[PDB]
Design a protein around this nucleic acid. Structure first.
Lengths: 348, 554, 95, 338, 95, 340
DNA sequence: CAATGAGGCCGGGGCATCATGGCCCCGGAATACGGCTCTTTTCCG
DNA sequence: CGGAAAAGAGCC
DNA sequence: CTGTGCCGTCCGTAACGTTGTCGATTTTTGTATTCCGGGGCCATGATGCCCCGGCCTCATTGAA
DNA sequence: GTCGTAGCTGAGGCCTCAGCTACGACTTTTT
């Protein structure tokens, strides 16, 4: 292994949740304007990525410059539903991307790794339970009956014989864990935030707590796009997550290891930080929706934890969550070059 | 009788901080401004300088929030100037502002401040008011820290009331605080000279790092004989021939000198006097001709000490015997370390070093001042014949020194012009800095008062001719500051051009700040701070605090 | 690991002002009259005097470069007598 | 559907109903018919709404971007599961040596067959007859017989390697009905690294111009334009354009340079033999690119079925058939020889 | 042991300018347009905002206080693009 | 005596040296001449001009030239590097060690002040209508006390009878007002001289007295003598004991009537006063109007300290001072104190 | 006239400081499969 | 000794 | 004569209403390799200063 | 929400200087 180099990063992404932005290239200034009134601006130097939640306006001159500075704009839906993206005439390496065509056209390493993803998902869905189970009496720690059950989809995932059984391993592991996610939040669902983990998976949300996961993950996928558009990878060739339109099929595959760390822990802070009040929501128009006032809280919020520093298991060198994204990605193309026989996982 | 008046309350807090501190403050004056005391005013003069409501003589029902009120109870023995009072009807609260945060001490108030509110309450109680407690308002945090007049705080107050009177009447000033960390914050150590004195008073201490010079500027030179000086506010614009040649920032101008017919505007003079800034007129050549005072340097105890000790020939004789021997010792130290020949002469002769300091033992065994006098002049003389050789490795073109054109008015050797000036301007430095310590340079134990040269500015200049005035001549010759082309002739004797006159002055200005070490006290010391440390102990030795004098023999 | 900076633009050509302003508003936030506040680390600083050495002739335009500390503890070093000074920090523009 | 092109870099593109109706200043000017629609060519500063865009991104309909003259700023892709399939089809068939060579043999005959069309009909060096020598005409027919079974991509090379230099030893005889002063082709190289001839100043600039469209028209569908069957990629080779610009390699790139001088527009003084073969003036370069447009918009018909269109719409139609041949409905890829 | 400073006077009253200038030329050497250069240690600094808090109303006059290091190693921290910046140091005016 | 100081009143004046002469030019036109023969300390007003030649000349002859504002408001002097007055400085220090010098002159001051007070009692006695004359018993009792003062045995005795002498005179100080009691002008015979003045009349006296110490100390320091080294008053604790030693007879002649002048003309009024728990303070309108009374008294010409030449009060201050410096070093014995 | 120690200088051992040379790495510039076959104007027999 | 290939040439 | 108060008088703040419009790579493409050179870096070398004490000179008290 | 934005002109607001006319500060002792 020895993925010696971590990606440092000069800039950080820009966000537009307001449906009436107006974002200006003023030479170096990526000014934003709002109904002919500026709200903020960005020098183009410190900007890493651009996203447009639903109808967010822009000038091609800025596109011209944004492409001129080769900064990935993601046209998104309002709930962060990933719907548009741009890449600068693709990645110049074929040998890297050809690693995966042959590897994806190969099924074994898919099962060898699709396993290692929800195995890496359950291994740290569970650790978040010990971390984010809001228990107060005879309850301060997660139930070993639940914990060992996660150790069971753990082994059932790790002994997936096909790439569709592995799916069922996750859903019950989702069904079960999210059955228990209802205690993940403020001593268990308090102010109207009852975790109906059955409205989990529903295209539109009924529930307060079931209207938040579906965007962070809808966001989760979004960064993986650029986070995988970095090392030369292409996030459309899902090993087991069959490409859906809008679903970057392989960007969907690799978030299983960190599905819990990044959305199951941020939801359990904003709630547990009183950011999630069922009254902070657009309670309908999807059965349940939310407001920019708190949205602007979470989008910056979702950004900050993303800059928390933790170690990577192989060298213990602490690297922020964005910066640890590319490290685990290099392990791929080298495992995709076969350089590392095993695949280190950073299950937590 | 009128032997002791009412004590200001600002003088009682200092009593429990340090006694050597307090006796110096209360009994009289000479105060300056520090970190805490510049802040001491800046917070104050915006709020506490401006007065407020008068304290009602008939108090029934109304808020008492008076400010800047002067109390004086003739029975307790004290006078106050209250910061503020918070009172309802007739129960008043002493209110005093402070400077820092809440101190990390129990109650958030140090002891002197605790005494402050209580006696102030005792004074408020005196005029028929109920205080029973005070407060501390830290305008930095405005954290009102109340205090209640606990009886022993009255007890210390009265105890502090009584000891200060006993000490001040006695007139014997208490010893320094024993290596106290109050010294760094007291802002007296340079005038306290505590472990200066402590180590000097055989309470042999080992120097920590001292509380050392800041807050002063460098003097102003006007050697241009056609300069016209005028005010630009706190700027002092040096225009010569009606054009701004230089500007002098009054805030950092320490001394004023005038050589030859140099002019200054009247309102400028109006300014300089305001900041106790000396204006030392000198003729065009460095004869210290006159000076200025502002109703005098007010200290008297040192004055009476000096006269009483100057009225004493023994102090006149004992002190004078240390002067020239400290002078002659530095002469040999100067001759030897600067000694510059070619071969078999690159060392000072023992024969030369036989007799220079054979004068010391004779000066040590001088039975009186007059025999002490001849020993010096002979030693000074034998110094001079050997002086010529140490400039430019032998006299440069025309830069030839003469021992016997020395000590006389019209210098008819160029370097004897150079030696004439160096002494001429430098005696002022004693005359100026020794003035600040409240002493008298014309009342000489050793020398005699006569016009133009102060009898003690001469006395203390004895040791320091070789180190300062004699050395700068050599270097100015040696490095090339002064050569023959730097000299022009005249009716009187040898003289210098304007350009070199800058050159010797500024380098002379540079000799003044050069760091050396005190032989007794072993610390980096500049020359602008050699003399003033020296002036201070004289008062103390004239006061008798230090059993003897540190001659500063280097 | 950054630095904040300021600029003191006393420029002696309007064209140079614009390309200053253009690049300088492109560089620093308009802070005071002749002043922007600037936030620049190792890198782009070099791109000012890159930009501002053509942006100016060095004869007549005069600016002091106001190169400041690591931008995390700069509030001690400010006294903006009227309108208060304020850095713009490492945040993602959210709207 | 037909790939709609936004013509003037000033108008306004919007989505009214199920139609991307474009508009000039407060006036409807054209209708897109999203149901049968394709890529929209966004020229210099002509723009669309983030509702037509946000609908096109939904329906797997590409939105491409161009500069004023037409230079390509980057594209805007839909994150669908339709375009990657063809890329997967592209990438699945790419390593398949059969369909590789099955693809491979199909172009080389199309390139070879079309060459003798440019000769003899735009051979006008009569002398006695400009009709390309019958022995010369049959050699390519023999060479096409060679091409019918070239059992390797290296045999294909040796066949075409033979088949290349020879008619660059005959190029002057199509040039000017004779030899133009200076514009007489040295029967020699094709300006590989340096130009070497007045012809070599037009016959790598033009190909560089052709390599453009056979890359943009390929990313115009779900095809990575950079993974080729015939030409083995070498870390930066637009082989997919290269393997497939071959039929139009003579058909546009050479009719343009010919009628750049067949009518006599380009002469020796236009270019300067500076640090190489020659170096055209920009006005000459503008006229040549303008001349490129005349061939670029020259009318043509029947890519696979009778329809008369421009070369552009012809230059795009092939790749869709290609993907349709990439396990799509077409099992046999049409070659479109003229 | 001193500090150099600068001032960025963007004052919004001529009277205040003078008493500034008066006290500010009395404080710092006229350095650039809205700028003097200043040389102040522990002490007199306090006397500026003493002087300049009346010298200004804090509403409209705006100045950044430009409080600099120990005045002995300040040349690294200067780029005066046109006319070069220069402190005035601890010398005795000799004429 | 030796000579008199020259007062260069004009701020515009341009003062030069004409050899021995000290010429005054106003607009390059001569004003007057001092000739530096009968000259002494030279007084100059705000932004006036003294040429260095005349400057040096006075410094050459060791004239202690002072500096005054245009209003005449003082700043300070200019003393040469001469032994002219250190001798006085060393006598004064050495002679202050003498009780007789202390006791004699202390007696000389007390007798002068007692005579001046009763001299005023027979001057401004304002009992119009019924009491045009002061009580001779009051006058004679004062004549009695000065004899006791002349024969004061020790210092603790002279001060007590002096303070006793002061109180009884102040018992009648309230009497010489506008004809009767100055209602609204409270005057107590007992709350005097305490640091907060407890009366409006106490305030006028206290302010006038304080502006004497500054008057005398500068008049004292005009000659090379220490105002802080006194014979009769206690020297230490910030008190100039010597000016206070000599000003004692002139609280009547320089200060006491000043309160009476400013009150009997109606200038001082109770609205010009403020009361604060034992603090009776004026207004600055009153304070600066009050000082104007002081200068009006200081410009009046009195003829005979010992010689009859109609000098102002302030120019008589030096006359007494120089005479004292002659009792020091023994030039004129007994200090012929000027008393009225 | 002569004693046991002060003052101070001479007089170097100690070492940091700089700057150049050794080394290593890196980068570019060029040469060689490596390497097939179809075709086409001076030779060998 | 001219053919005629075969060599080697240009190049791919 | 020292302000400070206008008195202006240009130059140093921005922001804005016009018509420019702009602007576009570049002279392919066989490759892969290795070596050679440059540069930087690193290590070691000597040298200069400051320091410190032995040594000298030499008090001056001690001593006859 | 019509090309959008770069670039130039005016009108006002800061910033300083040269050139004029008024003027004529100074306040007890204490914090």
């Amino acid at each position: 292994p020895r993925p010696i180099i971590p990606a440092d990063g000069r800039g950080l992404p820009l966000y537009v949740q307001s449906p009436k932005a107006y974002v200006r290239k003023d030479g170096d200034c990526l000014v934003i304007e709002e109904e002919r009134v500026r709200v903020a601006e960005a020098r183009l130097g410190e900007t890493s990525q651009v996203a447009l939640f639903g109808n967010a306006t822009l000038t091609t001159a800025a596109l011209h410059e944004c492409l001129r500075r080769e900064i990935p704009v993601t046209w998104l839906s309002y709930g962060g539903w990933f719907m548009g993206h741009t890449v600068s005439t693709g990645h110049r390496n074929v040998e890297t991307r050809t690693y995966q065509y042959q590897r994806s056209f190969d099924p074994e390493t898919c099962l060898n790794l699709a396993r290692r993803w929800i195995v890496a998902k359950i291994a740290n869905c569970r650790t978040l339970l010990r971390r984010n189970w809001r228990g107060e009496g005879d309850e301060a720690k997660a139930p070993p009956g639940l914990l060992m059950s996660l150790q069971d989809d753990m082994r059932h995932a790790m002994r997936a014989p096909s790439l569709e059984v592995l799916l069922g391993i996750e859903g019950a592991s989702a069904g079960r864990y999210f059955q228990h996610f209802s205690r993940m939040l403020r001593g268990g669902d308090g102010e109207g935030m009852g975790f109906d983990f059955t409205t989990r998976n529903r295209r539109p949300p009924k529930d307060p707590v079931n209207a938040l996961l579906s965007f962070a993950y809808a966001m989760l996928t979004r960064e993986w796009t650029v986070a995988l558009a970095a090392v030369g990878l292409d996030p459309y060739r899902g090993f087991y997550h069959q490409p859906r339109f809008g679903r970057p099929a392989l960007a969907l595959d690799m978030m299983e290891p960190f599905r819990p760390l990044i959305a199951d822990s941020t939801v359990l802070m904003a709630i547990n930080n009183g950011e999630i009040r069922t009254g902070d929501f657009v309670r309908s128009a999807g059965g349940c929706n939310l407001t920019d006032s708190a949205r602007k809280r979470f989008i910056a919020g979702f950004e900050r934890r993303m800059e928390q520093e933790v170690t990577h298991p192989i060298f213990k060198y602490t690297i922020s969550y964005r910066r640890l994204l590319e490290v685990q990605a290099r392990l791929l193309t080298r495992y995709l070059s076969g350089e590392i026989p095993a695949y280190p996982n950073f299950v937590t | 009788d009128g032997s002791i008046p009412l004590i200001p309350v600002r003088m009682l807090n200092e009593h429990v901080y340090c006694p050597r501190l307090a006796y110096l403050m209360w009994v009289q004056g000479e105060f300056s401004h520090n970190e805490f005391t510049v802040d001491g005013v800046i917070r104050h003069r915006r709020v506490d300088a401006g007065g407020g409501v008068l304290p009602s003589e008939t108090q029934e029902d109304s808020r008492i929030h008076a400010r800047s009120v002067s109390l004086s109870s003739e029975r307790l023995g004290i006078t106050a100037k209250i910061d503020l009072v918070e009172g309802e009807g007739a129960y008043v609260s002493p209110v005093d502002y402070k400077r820092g945060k809440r101190p990390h001490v129990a109650g958030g108030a140090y002891e002197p401040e605790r005494v402050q509110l209580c006696a102030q309450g005792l004074l408020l109680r005196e005029h028929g008011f109920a205080s029973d407690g005070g407060a501390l308002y830290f305008v930095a945090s405005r954290e009102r820290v109340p205090v209640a007049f606990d009886d022993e705080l009255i007890g210390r107050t009265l105890a502090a009331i009584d000891e200060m009177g006993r000490t001040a009447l006695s007139g014997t000033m208490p010893p320094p605080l024993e290596d106290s960390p109050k010294c760094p914050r007291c802002s007296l150590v340079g005038i306290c000279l505590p472990d200066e004195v402590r180590f000097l008073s055989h309470l042999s201490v080992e120097p920590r790092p001292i509380i050392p010079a800041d807050g002063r500027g460098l003097p102003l030179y006007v050697q241009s004989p056609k300069a016209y000086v005028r005010k630009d506010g706190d700027c002092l614009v040096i225009e010569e021939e009606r054009v701004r040649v230089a500007e002098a920032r009054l805030g950092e101008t320490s001394q004023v000198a005038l050589f030859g017919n140099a002019t200054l505007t009247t309102a400028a003079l109006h300014e300089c006097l305001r900041r106790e800034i000396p204006v030392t007129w000198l003729s065009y050549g460095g004869w210290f001709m006159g000076h200025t005072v502002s109703t005098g340097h007010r200290n008297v105890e040192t004055r009476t000490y000096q006269y009483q000790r100057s009225f004493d020939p023994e102090t006149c004789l004992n002190l004078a015997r240390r002067w020239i021997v400290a002078k002659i010792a530095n002469c040999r130290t100067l001759l030897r370390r600067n000694w510059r020949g070619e071969g078999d002469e690159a060392k000072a002769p023992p024969g030369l070093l036989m007799s220079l300091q054979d004068d010391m033992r004779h000066a040590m065994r001088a039975p009186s001042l007059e025999v002490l006098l001849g020993i010096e002049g002979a030693s000074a003389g034998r110094y001079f014949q050997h002086f010529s050789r140490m400039l430019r490795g032998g006299d440069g073109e025309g830069m030839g020194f003469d021992f016997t054109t020395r000590n006389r008015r019209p210098p008819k050797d160029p370097v004897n012009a150079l030696l004439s000036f160096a002494y001429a301007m430098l005696t002022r430095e004693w005359t100026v800095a020794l003035a600040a310590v409240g002493l008298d340079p014309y009342r000489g134990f050793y020398h005699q008062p006569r016009f133009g040269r102060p009898a003690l500015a001469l006395d203390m200049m004895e040791p320091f001719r070789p180190l300062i005035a004699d050395s700068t001549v050599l270097m100015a010759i040696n490095n090339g500051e002064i050569r023959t082309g730097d000299f022009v002739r005249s009716a009187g004797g040898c003289n210098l051009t304007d350009s070199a006159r800058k050159r010797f002055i500024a380098g002379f200005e540079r000799r003044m700040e050069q760091e050396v070490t005190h032989p007794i006290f072993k610390y980096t010391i500049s020359y602008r701070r050699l003399l003033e440390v020296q002036a201070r102990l004289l008062t103390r030795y004239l006061s008798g605090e230090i059993p003897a004098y540190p001659n500063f023999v280097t | 690991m950054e630095h904040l900076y300021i600029v003191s633009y006393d420029i002696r050509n309007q064209r140079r002002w614009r390309r200053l302003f253009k690049t300088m508003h492109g560089f620093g936030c308009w802070l005071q009259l002749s002043v922007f506040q600037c936030r620049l680390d190792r890198i782009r600083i070099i791109k000012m005097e890159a930009a501002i050495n053509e942006i100016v002739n060095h004869a007549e335009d005069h600016v002091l470069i106001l190169d400041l500390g690591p931008a995390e503890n700069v509030k001690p070093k400010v006294s903006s007598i009227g309108k208060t000074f304020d850095p713009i920090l490492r945040q993602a523009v959210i709207v």
